[PDB]
Design a protein around this ligand. Sequence first.
Ligand SMILES: *[C@@H]1O[C@H](CO)[C@@H](O[C@@H]2O[C@H](CO)[C@@H](O[C@@H]3O[C@H](CO)[C@@H](O)[C@H](O)[C@@H]3O)[C@H](O)[C@H]2NC(C)=O)[C@H](O)[C@H]1NC(C)=O
Ligand SMILES: *[C@@H]1O[C@H](CO)[C@@H](O[C@@H]2O[C@H](CO)[C@@H](O[C@@H]3O[C@H](CO)[C@@H](O)[C@H](O)[C@@H]3O)[C@H](O)[C@H]2NC(C)=O)[C@H](O)[C@H]1NC(C)=O
Ligand SMILES: *[C@@H]1O[C@H](CO[C@@H]2O[C@@H](C)[C@@H](O)[C@@H](O)[C@@H]2O)[C@@H](O[C@@H]2O[C@H](CO)[C@@H](O)[C@H](O)[C@H]2NC(C)=O)[C@H](O)[C@H]1NC(C)=O
Ligand SMILES: *[C@@H]1O[C@H](CO)[C@@H](O[C@@H]2O[C@H](CO)[C@@H](O)[C@H](O)[C@H]2NC(C)=O)[C@H](O)[C@H]1NC(C)=O
Ligand SMILES: *[C@@H]1O[C@H](CO[C@@H]2O[C@@H](C)[C@@H](O)[C@@H](O)[C@@H]2O)[C@@H](O)[C@H](O)[C@H]1NC(C)=O
Ligand SMILES: OC[C@@]1(CCc2ccccc2)NC[C@H](O)[C@@H](O)[C@@H]1O
Ligand SMILES: [Cl-]
Ligand SMILES: [Cl-]
Ligand SMILES: [Cl-]
Ligand SMILES: [Cl-]
Ligand SMILES: [Cl-]
Length: 842
Amino acid sequence: QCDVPPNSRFDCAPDKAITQEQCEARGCCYIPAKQGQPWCFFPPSYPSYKLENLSSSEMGYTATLTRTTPTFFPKDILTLRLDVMMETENRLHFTIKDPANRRYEVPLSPLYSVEFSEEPFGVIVHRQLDGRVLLNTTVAPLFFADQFLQLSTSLPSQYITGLAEHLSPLMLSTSWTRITLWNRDLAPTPGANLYGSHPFYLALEDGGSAHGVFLLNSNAMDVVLQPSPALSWRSTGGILDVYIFLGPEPKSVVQQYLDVVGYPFMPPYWGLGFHLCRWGYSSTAITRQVVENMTRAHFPLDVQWNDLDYMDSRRDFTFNKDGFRDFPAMVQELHQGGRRYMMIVDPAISSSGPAGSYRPYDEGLRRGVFITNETGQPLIGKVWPGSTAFPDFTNPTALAWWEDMVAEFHDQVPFDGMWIDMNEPSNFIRGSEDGCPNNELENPPYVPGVVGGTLQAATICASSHQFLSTHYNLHNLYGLTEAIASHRALVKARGTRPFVISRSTFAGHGRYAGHWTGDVWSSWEQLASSVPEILQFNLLGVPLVGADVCGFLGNTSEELCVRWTQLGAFYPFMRNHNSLLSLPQEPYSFSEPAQQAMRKALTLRYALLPHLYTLFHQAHVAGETVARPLFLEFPKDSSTWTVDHQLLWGEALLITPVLQAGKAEVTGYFPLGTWYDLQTVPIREPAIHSEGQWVTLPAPLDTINVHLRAGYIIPLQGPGLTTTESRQQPMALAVALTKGGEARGELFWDDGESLEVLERGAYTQVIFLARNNTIVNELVRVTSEGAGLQLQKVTVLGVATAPQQVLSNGVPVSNFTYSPDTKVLDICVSLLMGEQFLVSWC
Ligand SMILES: *[C@@H]1O[C@H](CO)[C@@H](O[C@@H]2O[C@H](CO)[C@@H](O[C@@H]3O[C@H](CO)[C@@H](O)[C@H](O)[C@@H]3O)[C@H](O)[C@H]2NC(C)=O)[C@H](O)[C@H]1NC(C)=O
Ligand SMILES: *[C@@H]1O[C@H](CO)[C@@H](O[C@@H]2O[C@H](CO)[C@@H](O[C@@H]3O[C@H](CO)[C@@H](O)[C@H](O)[C@@H]3O)[C@H](O)[C@H]2NC(C)=O)[C@H](O)[C@H]1NC(C)=O
Ligand SMILES: *[C@@H]1O[C@H](CO[C@@H]2O[C@@H](C)[C@@H](O)[C@@H](O)[C@@H]2O)[C@@H](O[C@@H]2O[C@H](CO)[C@@H](O)[C@H](O)[C@H]2NC(C)=O)[C@H](O)[C@H]1NC(C)=O
Ligand SMILES: *[C@@H]1O[C@H](CO)[C@@H](O[C@@H]2O[C@H](CO)[C@@H](O)[C@H](O)[C@H]2NC(C)=O)[C@H](O)[C@H]1NC(C)=O
Ligand SMILES: *[C@@H]1O[C@H](CO[C@@H]2O[C@@H](C)[C@@H](O)[C@@H](O)[C@@H]2O)[C@@H](O)[C@H](O)[C@H]1NC(C)=O
Ligand SMILES: OC[C@@]1(CCc2ccccc2)NC[C@H](O)[C@@H](O)[C@@H]1O
Ligand SMILES: [Cl-]
Ligand SMILES: [Cl-]
Ligand SMILES: [Cl-]
Ligand SMILES: [Cl-]
Ligand SMILES: [Cl-]
């Protein structure tokens, strides 16, 4: 019975160090490892639940689950209800609940077949097409106690991604890895629970099919991977609410997941521009000098930010009357030059001022908006202003108070978005100024592998009261609930698309806000680690994501700042942010050659903004990723599965960054096909003809490698120091022909910031097609927004022979150049995106 292969052993002492005698007393097997692998593990006969009275309804399947022998955890729930819902051809949904008591729940032919094991209970999910076993929860016992749920499954391969937020390769290690989901303020470092929690994984299958699993549970949890391969969800509360997404393509799995949690929000066009911030712009005069210095050196800047500097004594919804006396005028002036303005907002509200002196606290107290403690008073912690209370964003009155504080502050200073920090929520002391009570929420029977070994570390008491539940159940939603409240507040205050950037996140955050990866070191290792983390957030439906460009903590170097700007110009959210005690790292603060390299990176990003905005439209309407790993686009090429130091924008733009000091070249993977060097497009081989292989590319310090996939057309737009300027420029097409002379692309265009654009039809959508030495547009929708768009240049890659003639609408063109070396045809035209054209050559 104890003859269990080592990799298939499931831990029977997850709760503590255990002796052979205690292990065998639990009904478990004790076999020491010969060198991690559990010594105490479940025999196949270990008591689980038994399935009884399975019945079929129009809803799907229902059953009773009964445990007869108690586990070693307190408060087993001996009778459960199983509900299995076949919701779509791609989505299976099952829940395990207590039929006698409402437990906390998070507020939010088919491709599969399902069968059940009776004793021990398990759910088995097959892919119907090839019979692969995707889920099998029979592999280990089901635990369902008041503060301990455990559900296990086999995995179909060693390849699994998800379970943010952690600093790790994109593909998670199955070598006895414990992944802890408990939102925590900590500088990103491996093996730690960071700012957000996304209980979703995508598992690859031999052949390139994939499935996804979402556990809709917001409690502190560990997810344990083992090399059999297998996975165990271990949660401290709530219910088992499981979604399986059948794909079969990894891009379809992500879309199906986003059909449950929400499609990404559509950012304003200006949010895709360059953002510049630091802690230490300590007056309006210094802040204005940043914009002046960027402009003087020809660096694009859409959005100027301030950190805590603007505040009066580090209090939200205030501004100091020293350095920031003319704060309103500074922001009106940024607007007059065509820029936007963002500033930090903390959740915690100063509680120590004299009564009637600080409206956010005084009004919060009147309306009962704050998280309360055991004696029904506001829980007091310590953050920047000193003593603070913590708003409860699950309370409908707190949402109304937050909308009012934001609208009142906006009437003083017309900010364009909110940077919401410290929303784990982060606490400089443990729990509260008054400590925490001694109860089973503060001291639970199973504590996941959190930094500091307590749920209270760097946050508030777990037994504190919110409107919907205790903090114990809601902690991992705190940031998400503040992002919702802030998205609503900004819609109401400004009447245009909101722009919220949040530290802490939970599954479905991307429906409301973006994310930055937090307090990353200015190091080559954190530069490199940023690529998998940005890709991971795109797979989780938070495509508006980036890292602080050049790093946050410590001092950047010139070389690191060049490489980081080059890669960071391909973050969907691009901000350079810097800590208080650091050397300056604005683009204008470096040597002339470093400035030229950083200016080229920013110029290329601005030229691509119509394309990046179109990719955001596809995320918003169809659950697509913006930045995506090669394995999402080429899943049938197993060589792509471990690549996470390259990225795609959409289907067609491959970015191969240098991520190490002292390198003048880089080796990247090129899937089968032709890849054109984007340096051959007016803004080293001209084309890589790949069989699916690794290629060494020249990569001097002034260069980042970017390749355009054959078969794709990219819209570009002329230059500007802001999107206010760039959006008025003529456009261009880059047309990457296949060997057979074909290519396709698209452009989505609207006014860049209105609400309900898609509902109201206030947009333009154009498809571009190349075939047989002709390029045409196909007008899906044309409205006022895009009818004035001017096309001035058409650059055609892979043109084998110099044309005799180039026609635009049947008339010879005024000017074109053909390069026989690069096989580029560059065509000057005067056409309109929104009117049918036909360009031809021979
Ligand atoms: C889902 O996972 C469960 C548990 O790992 C799998 O059930 C187990 O299947 C093994 C191998 O077939 C069974 O062992 C076999 O049992 C027969 C009858 O005693 C014996 O003659 C063979 O020599 C062999 O050892 C094992 O009994 C069974 N375990 C349980 C708990 O039922 C199951 O196969 C998986 N389902 C799928 C579709 O993969
Ligand atoms: C729930 O939160 C409230 C705050 O909203 C806690 O109130 C705090 O209670 C402690 C005593 O338990 C007060 O300390 C006292 O302060 C005075 C000076 O002002 C001093 O003379 C006393 O020796 C004592 O230190 C503390 O002031 C008070 N905080 C505030 C902001 O009034 C309450 O204790 C919390 N309840 C639990 C069970 O944790
Ligand atoms: C499994 O179900 C049986 C039968 O329950 C009945 O049929 C169902 C479809 C539904 O209409 C129920 O409300 C019915 O009671 C349960 O066995 C019965 O248990 C009750 C209560 O102890 C008893 O009065 C009956 O004599 C039993 N009937 C038979 C035919 O055995 C059984 O308890 C259920 N199992 C579990 C573990 O819940
Ligand atoms: C904007 O750039 C100006 C000009 O480089 C900076 O001011 C200079 O900074 C040096 C130190 O590098 C001072 O010692 C000089 O007195 C300044 N020169 C001039 C012409 O004023 C300024 O610090 C920059 N501001 C910011 C916020 O980056
Ligand atoms: C970051 O740099 C700060 C200032 O460093 C000084 O100036 C730079 C240009 C170098 O010449 C350096 O050797 C000088 O000391 C430091 O005060 C600060 O501690 C640095 N931070 C870290 C964490 O190393
Ligand atoms: O608002 C201040 C700030 C940095 C605090 C800090 C503490 C210790 C050391 C360094 C910085 N809060 C944390 C944010 O993630 C960061 O972007 C922001 O600038
Ligand atoms: Cl509850
Ligand atoms: Cl939605
Ligand atoms: Cl309620
Ligand atoms: Cl090709
Ligand atoms: Cl023309």
